[PDB]
Structure formats: C-alpha cells, structure tokens
Amino acid sequence: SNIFEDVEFCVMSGTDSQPKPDLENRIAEFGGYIVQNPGPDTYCVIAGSENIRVKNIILSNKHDVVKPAWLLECFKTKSFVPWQPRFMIHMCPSTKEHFAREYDCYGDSYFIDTDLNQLKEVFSGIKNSNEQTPEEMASLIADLEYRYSWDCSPLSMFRRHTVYLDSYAVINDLSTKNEGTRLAIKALELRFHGAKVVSCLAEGVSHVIIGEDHSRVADFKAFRRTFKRKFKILKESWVTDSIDKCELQEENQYL
C-alpha cells in the first residue's frame, strides 16, 4: 500500500479536525518524505488555514499550496488524483501556465462536463460586480432567452410583455397614487412574475390593465390614437387565467 514514492510534502495546517500529527504519520507510513519548511525539492505545501505562513508563501510565487482535502481524497481512493483549482489556494507560475491551458481562469474546465455541485463551486468563486445597468441587463436577458429557444420558462413568461396599470388618478403623476386593493397586489404579482411595470406612460408601453373603473377607458382610447403603436385593454380574468394555467392566454378573448 505504497502509492507515493520519494515525494516531499510540507504541512502547516492549523485549526482543523485533522491536526498535523495524524497527516504527518499517515504520510510517513505512505512512503512520503515530510519536511517542516518548503524548498526547491518539495512539490506541494498543505495548509487548511489562512495563517501568516501561507500568506508569505503566496506572496512568493515559487510554490503550490493545496488544501488538506486533496490528501484526504488521495487516501480515500488509494491512488494519485490529479490536482485541481478546487484543491488549491495558490499556484506558482509554472502551475498557472499549466492550468491556464485546459482550465479557464475561474475554477471551470472546457474538457470535462460539469454537474450541479461543480457549477455551484464555480459560481462561489465569482464575486458580485456592478458594471451593468437595469435596462441593458434586461435586454441581454431577453436576447439570451430568445437565442436558445429559451422562452419556455414559467417565471419568465412575461419577459417581453410590459404592462401599465391604471392605479393613478392622473397619468404621468406620481403624487396621485391610489389605494387599490386588488389592483396594487395584481400589479405586484405581475412584476414578480417577470412582467415590467412602468409608473410613467411612455412610448415603450405594450399592454394596459384597467380595473373595475370604466371611466378611464375613453382617456386611454384617446391617448393610444396619438401613440405610434396602440396597446390593448384587458380585464382581470386574463391575468388570473394565465397564472392558473401557467401559460399565456389569448388577448382576443379578454380584449
């Protein structure tokens, strides 16, 4: 049971459920040289904690740091498992060049498929960035949804249907908010379901929803005449039926 053959390892792990002595004894009984400090001959240093020594090693680009999990997996399978950015904390320039070929800059590969857990691991490394703006992200999402026959999602079923609600007594006035009970929550649900709700009636509006107040129908019918594109007036049964059936209903039956 000697998988290893004349290989030098340095261990500096601190706070861990598998302290240093057990790993050192295991390495010794696995035919593996153990050293207390790194050197030109050692080909890996293991440390499960971000102490000062690992930071110093990181700042000196001459060695590779590997998490303890790599050696545990090696023990489990009784075979030499190839390294991976998953089992790594830092890479020397040679390992950076090697992994830059078949492993992308993040922790993903383009030669082997991936599963849910692997993709979650890749996403964990990625950090939030704010180089985007709402409208452009929405447009890019729409293009992505259109590209790969990707319009079949139930929660993105209103991506391309912007809806304007008649919850304001005076159009284009934010100070005339009403106290609609059903209308307000219905608009909130529409927004939550992927639809786009705009408080200001602009040229980008596509659909219009009017509650049980029919007095405003004439105003909307007059406004749509000047608009280059005419929107459609629909009743509340349309949205409820669409949500219940999980699929869009024809507006002809609800115009």
Partner: protein, 32 residues
C-alpha cells in the same frame, strides 16, 4: 421561488455542456 433556482441551475448546465462539447469537437478536429 425555491424551485426557481434549481430550474436556473439545471438550465445553465446544459448550455455550458453544449459549449464544452463544441470545444471538444474542435479539439478533436485539431488533433490531426
């Protein structure tokens, strides 16, 4: 809401795998 995230993950997986398969095919062609 809970099922949304798993749907999105399974959704991204297939397209990423398709792109990786395209990379594999291109590398196989380049093997010549």
């Amino acid at each position: 809401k809970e099922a949304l995230e798993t749907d999105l993950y399974k959704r991204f997986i297939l397209v990423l795998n398709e792109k990786k398969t395209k990379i594999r095919s291109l590398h196989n062609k380049l093997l010549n």
